Amino acid sequence: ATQGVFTLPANTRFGVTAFANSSGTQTVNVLVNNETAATFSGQSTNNAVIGTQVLNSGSSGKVQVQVSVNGRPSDLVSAQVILTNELNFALVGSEDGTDNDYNDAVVVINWPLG
């Protein structure tokens, strides 16, 4: 099944933050309504934040996270979790190699902000 795609409420600000746990440089693309709205690139084996930004979900609310290393898309896992019917987390893990730790880039999307 498709992973890394989330429908947010329309016209809503959200945070997106990416962490890296891999020898490879991670490239994280964040699309809103099928167009790139943010791109993070970095390398860390220690969960360093390689990027954090505030975006707007726009008229469609469609947000997609893509992760690649050296042109090779990583295998994504994702889910959305809502706490007290209000606080939303859209979560992505990714595997760029052979060990299936799925942490090579970790992406956290959170809303509402403010």
Binding site: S23, G24, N70, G97, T98
Partner: peptide, 6 residues
């Protein structure tokens, strides 16, 4: 790690 072995 990017390497033939990996």
């Amino acid at each position: 790690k990017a390497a033939k072995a990996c």
